Amino acid sequence: LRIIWGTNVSIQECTTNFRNFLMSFKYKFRKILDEREEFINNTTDEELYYIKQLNEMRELGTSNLNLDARNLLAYKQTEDLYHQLLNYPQEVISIMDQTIKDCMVSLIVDNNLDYDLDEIETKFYKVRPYNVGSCKGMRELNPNDIDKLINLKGLVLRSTPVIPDMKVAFFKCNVCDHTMAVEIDRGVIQEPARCERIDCNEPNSMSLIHNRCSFADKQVIKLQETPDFVPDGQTPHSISLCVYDELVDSCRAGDRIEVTGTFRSIPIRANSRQRVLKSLYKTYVDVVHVKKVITDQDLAKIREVAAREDLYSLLARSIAPSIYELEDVKKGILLQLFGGTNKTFTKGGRYRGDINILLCGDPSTSKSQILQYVHKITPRGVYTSGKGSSAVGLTAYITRDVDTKQLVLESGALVLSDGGVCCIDEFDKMSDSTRSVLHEVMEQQTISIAKAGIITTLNARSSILASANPIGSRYNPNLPVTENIDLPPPLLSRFDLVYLVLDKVDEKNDRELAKHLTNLYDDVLPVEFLTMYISYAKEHIHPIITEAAKTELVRAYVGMRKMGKRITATTRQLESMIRLAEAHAKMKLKNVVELEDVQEAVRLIRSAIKDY
Amino acid sequence: SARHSRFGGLLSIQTPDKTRLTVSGSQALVDEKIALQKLDDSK
Amino acid sequence: ALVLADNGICCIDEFDKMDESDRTAIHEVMEQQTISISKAGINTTLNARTSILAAANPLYGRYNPRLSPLDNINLPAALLSRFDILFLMLDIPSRDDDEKLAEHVTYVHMHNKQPDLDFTPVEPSKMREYIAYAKTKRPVMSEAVNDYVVQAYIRLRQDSKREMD
DNA sequence: AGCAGAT
DNA sequence: ATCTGCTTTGGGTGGGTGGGTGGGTTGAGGCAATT
Ligand SMILES: Nc1ncnc2c1ncn2[C@@H]1O[C@H](COP(=O)(O)OP(=O)(O)OP(=O)(O)O)[C@@H](O)[C@H]1O
Ligand SMILES: [Mg+2]
Numbered sequence: 001l002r003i004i005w006g007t008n009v010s011i012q013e014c015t016t017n018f019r020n021f022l023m024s025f026k027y028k029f030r031k032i033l034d035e036r037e038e039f040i041n042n043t044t045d046e047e048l049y050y051i052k053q054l055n056e057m058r059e060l061g062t063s064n065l066n067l068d069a070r071n072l073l074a075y076k077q078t079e080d081l082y083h084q085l086l087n088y089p090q091e092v093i094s095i096m097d098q099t100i101k102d103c104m105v106s107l108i109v110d111n112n113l114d115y116d117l118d119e120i121e122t123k124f125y126k127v128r129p130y131n132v133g134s135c136k137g138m139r140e141l142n143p144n145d146i147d148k149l150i151n152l153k154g155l156v157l158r159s160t161p162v163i164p165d166m167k168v169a170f171f172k173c174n175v176c177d178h179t180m181a182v183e184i185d186r187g188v189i190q191e192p193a194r195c196e197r198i199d200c201n202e203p204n205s206m207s208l209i210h211n212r213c214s215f216a217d218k219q220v221i222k223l224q225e226t227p228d229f230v231p232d233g234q235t236p237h238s239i240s241l242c243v244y245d246e247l248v249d250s251c252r253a254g255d256r257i258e259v260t261g262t263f264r265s266i267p268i269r270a271n272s273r274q275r276v277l278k279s280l281y282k283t284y285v286d287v288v289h290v291k292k293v294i295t296d297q298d299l300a301k302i303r304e305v306a307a308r309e310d311l312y313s314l315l316a317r318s319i320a321p322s323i324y325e326l327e328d329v330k331k332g333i334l335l336q337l338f339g340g341t342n343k344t345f346t347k348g349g350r351y352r353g354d355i356n357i358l359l360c361g362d363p364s365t366s367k368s369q370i371l372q373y374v375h376k377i378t379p380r381g382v383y384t385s386g387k388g389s390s391a392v393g394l395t396a397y398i399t400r401d402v403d404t405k406q407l408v409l410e411s412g413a414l415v416l417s418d419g420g421v422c423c424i425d426e427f428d429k430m431s432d433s434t435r436s437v438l439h440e441v442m443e444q445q446t447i448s449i450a451k452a453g454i455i456t457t458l459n460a461r462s463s464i465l466a467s468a469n470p471i472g473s474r475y476n477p478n479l480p481v482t483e484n485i486d487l488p489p490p491l492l493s494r495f496d497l498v499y500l501v502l503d504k505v506d507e508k509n510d511r512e513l514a515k516h517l518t519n520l521y522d523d524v525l526p527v528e529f530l531t532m533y534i535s536y537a538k539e540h541i542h543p544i545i546t547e548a549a550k551t552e553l554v555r556a557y558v559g560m561r562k563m564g565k566r567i568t569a570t571t572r573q574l575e576s577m578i579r580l581a582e583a584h585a586k587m588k589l590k591n592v593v594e595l596e597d598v599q600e601a602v603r604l605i606r607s608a609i610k611d612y
Numbered sequence: 613s614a615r616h617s618r619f620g621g622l623l624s625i626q627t628p629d630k631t632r633l634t635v636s637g638s639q640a641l642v643d644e645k646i647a648l649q650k651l652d653d654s655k
Numbered sequence: 656a657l658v659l660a661d662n663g664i665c666c667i668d669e670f671d672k673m674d675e676s677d678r679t680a681i682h683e684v685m686e687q688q689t690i691s692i693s694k695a696g697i698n699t700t701l702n703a704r705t706s707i708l709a710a711a712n713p714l715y716g717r718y719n720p721r722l723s724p725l726d727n728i729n730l731p732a733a734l735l736s737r738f739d740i741l742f743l744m745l746d747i748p749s750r751d752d753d754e755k756l757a758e759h760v761t762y763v764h765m766h767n768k769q770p771d772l773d774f775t776p777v778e779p780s781k782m783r784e785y786i787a788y789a790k791t792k793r794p795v796m797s798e799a800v801n802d803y804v805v806q807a808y809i810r811l812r813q814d815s816k817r818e819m820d
Numbered sequence: 821a822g823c824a825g826a827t
Numbered sequence: 828a829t830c831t832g833c834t835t836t837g838g839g840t841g842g843g844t845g846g847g848t849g850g851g852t853t854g855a856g857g858c859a860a861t862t
């Protein structure tokens with residue numbers, strides 16, 4: 001008879017109980033348990049749940065079964081099983097795993113299906129319980145909880161590289177070349193004193209072939225508690241975790257996760273020579289479950305919105321609803337998000353499809369708001385402020401890993417914005433070296449670093465949406481834009497659009513703005529739909545120019561040159577106009593650039609040249 | 613064993629007479645022939 | 656120290672002297688109300704909805720009437736604008752006021768107690784509990800008050816433009 | 821003092 | 828089964844032909860680059 005050590009509960013009864021639970025169970029039991037019986041339907045609740053879950057798992061070939069604890073309390077049989085799971089998690093999880101495998105094989109055996117049985121026999125099967133009681137606190141873990149299932153909510157802080165954990169040792173003889181694999185128990189190798197071969201019984205002739213053993217994946221994570229659990233505001237404590245097999249690399253640094261595991265404790269050796277152990281035991285958590293806290297229909301909805309006659313103003317309004325009366329700026333930013341076509345050229349250089357916009361004006365107006373909105377919308381991008389230590393940094397820089405004491409090349413904000421929008425909030429205050437790397441990016445669209453023995457180039461195909469403020473307390477219309485902005489002419493000449501949003505004091509304008517602001521205390525689109533639409537268009541559509549567009553572009557450029565001797569427009573404006581027309585075509589999901597696209601692009605560029 | 617080596621499942625097998633022996637391993641937790649094989653091999 | 660002040664008022668003395676790093680930190684706090692750390696050793700982001708109470712001295716060490724306030728203040732104009740209320744306290748010699756201050760300080764030095772007797776100060780505990788009670792509350796505003804504040808805003812903007820002239 | 825080796 | 832023998836913690840009562848990706852981390856002083 002098999003009995004768990006220190007208890008009086010049979011393993012056979014546990015196995016049969018859980019098998020009965022799995023083969024026969026319905027969600028209606030859970031619904032009645034939670035006092036939600038009136039919500040019971042007639043098809044899903046009356047159909048076997050875990051049998052369906054096993055069938056689908058077999059169809060998909062997966063093995064891990066996510067189990068909810070309450071369902072054990074829902075079935076009369078399994079109350080004791082639930083309590084035992086909460087008190088003796090290891091053995092209970094073991095019997096659960098074997099019962100899962102046994103029922104999996106029994107299903108095929110009974111249903112005489114054509115599915116291969118050898119493949120099923122080869123698989124290790126597992127269960128991942130979760131929601132096993134009110135989550136406790138890292139500061140409330142007393143010794144009473146050692147070897148017991150607990151729930152912890154905390155913020156990931158770090159995760160070590162995968163550790164190879166040994167399962168089966170491999171030994172080879174030096175006089176007969178006979179090999180046999182010996183399992184491992186609690187980290188001790190039961191290495192033989194002589195070959196198992198009768199013919200060659202030579203003693204103490206075993207060697208460990210390290211690369212022929214069997215290993216399993218292990219990883220150590222560090223966890224820190226949530227802010228709301230801090231009683232006064234002191235430094236949050238830290239607990240260490242251990243994740244094995246498919247939970248390895250299941251969470252990235254900085255994530256909020258809820259972890260279910262067994263609170264274990266292990267002795268620590270005093271030194272790496274003897275067997276003496278410190279009286280203080282070190283704790284950790286053995287995790288068994290972790291939680292983190294386009295379709296044809298989507299395509300059809302996208303076509304439906306695209307067919308709308310008033311699409312342009314709709315997207316413009318939806319970009320930043322809370323801002324008031326900045327239609328031109330919103331339209332320009334909407335064009336920037338989509339981005340113009342990118343050209344891969346043979347016999348010629350690469351031509352960038354990005355759009356760079358500078359939002360410069362008085363401090364009163366709303367400019368950081370628009371950058372925050374754009375960051376939210378952008379499928380890829382960063383937020384940064386020049387001369388800001390908080391920001392990661394605009395340029396790739398060589399550093400030393402404090403955790404591992406190694407040199408690592410870390411990419412800056414510009415490189416991490418590849419294919420996206422990098423919003424720089426404070427463009428005015430910038431280091432000269434930062435303004436050099438920015439020039440190299442906006443010109444060559446790559447960052448080259450040749451220090452610390454490394455010579456490498458990093459792609460930085462990212463748009464830029466910066467903001468600027470005047471030197472004084474307000475913008476002086478009399479002086480030119482260059483004098484007020486305090487930026488080199490070489491630098492503010494590269495932006496495709498420059499927007500002068502000025503807070504001129506007008507009775508009507510102030511009245512309207514105050515009314516809007518106080519009221520804050522034409523449909524609009526959700527941010528998720530907007531970002532998905534933008535990503536779809538940016539990944540699939542690639543508009544092309546046509547003869548009519550070619551005529552209108554040439555004519556508009558010539559007209560913009562003839563206005564002036566003073567040079568009104570330069571060849572830069574032609575590239576800006578073509579990029580803006582391409583972006584406007586992208587927004588309509590059109591594969592061609594019509595007269596309307598080029599005409600819209602000129603209207604925005606000419607207006608931008610206008611007050612700027 | 614599906615779980616790692618340090619999972620730590622302990623067993624108590626009952627002899628025909630009222631004495632309990634201790635075995636370690638999930639396979640033992642499930643099976644009895646494996647338990648007896650481990651008993652013999654651990655000598 | 657800023658972390659301890661999260662969701663509370665921060666008491667910063669000698670604000671003008673402060674280094675550019677801390678100035679950028681507070682600039683971030685006011686705009687975003689967030690504490691961000693970007694280091695290889697650790698990467699932890701904490702929200703900070705905390706108020707700032709600053710004390711500073713003019714550029715030359717004393718206020719100069721000839722120079723306007725802006726020039727007297729070393730701090731960026733944007734930082735001054737972001738402040739909800741900016742108080743400028745000056746030390747003007749005067750026979751009566753000087754005599755009153757001297758009598759007050761000197762009585763405090765001789766007797767070790769407050770000199771005033773016209774009114775009795777309220778107990779600190781009562782004031783603290785009332786402040787907490789007020790923090791617990793939540794008022795509301797109507798449309799008529801909205802119109803009144805809007806009118807006040809246009810009046811203030813016109814006056815401020817005229818003054819800025 | 822615990823553990824690693826030669827008679 | 829008994830007798831013989833080396834080495835710690837971590838630290839200068841082992842050292843710099845073992846080094847600093849094996850840990851002992853502030854304080855002062857010189858140098859290039861930044862100003
Ligand atoms: N539609 C709007 N027009 C003008 N000002 C606005 C509008 N909406 C909000 N604001 C004001 O702008 C503030 C947000 O803008 P923000 O303070 O970032 O200004 P900025 O010009 O980007 O920079 P700075 O920080 O130097 O003032 C809001 O707090 C509100 O006071
Ligand atoms: Mg701003």
Ligand SMILES: [Zn+2]
Pocket residue numbers: 173174175176177178195197200201202205
């Ligand atoms: Zn052999």
